[PDB]
């Protein structure tokens, strides 16, 4: 975030000078990763089963 200051009233002395300041930003990433499983079974068991 930026910051403001209170300022005097002169041409001569540093209290009269408006301060400078900076806003900044940053980065966040979604990175896709894989989750998986392999489940093997006999084809005879698939044929014999009632479900």
């Amino acid at each position: 975030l930026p910051e403001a200051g209170w300022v005097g009233e002169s041409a001569t002395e540093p209290e009269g000078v408006i301060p400078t300041s900076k806003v900044t930003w940053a980065n966040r990433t979604l990175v896709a990763e894989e989750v998986a499983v392999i489940i093997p079974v006999p084809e005879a068991v698939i044929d014999d089963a009632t479900v």
Binding site: E9, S10, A11, T12
Partner: protein, 51 residues
């Protein structure tokens, strides 16, 4: 060679506001707590039981 507020004398002129001026006012407590007896002379005598 600047022109200062002091060098613009009375081309700049102060304002006035009454917004802080008004003040509320409080009566006697004993005039509201107790009976206000109307008097027509300096003294009234009240008898009381004493023994």
């Amino acid at each position: 060679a600047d022109i200062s507020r002091a060098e613009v004398a009375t081309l700049i002129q102060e304002a006035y506001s009454d917004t802080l001026l008004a003040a509320a006012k409080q009566g006697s407590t004993v005039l509201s707590a107790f009976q206000n007896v109307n008097m027509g002379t300096k003294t009234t005598h009240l008898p009381v039981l004493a023994t």
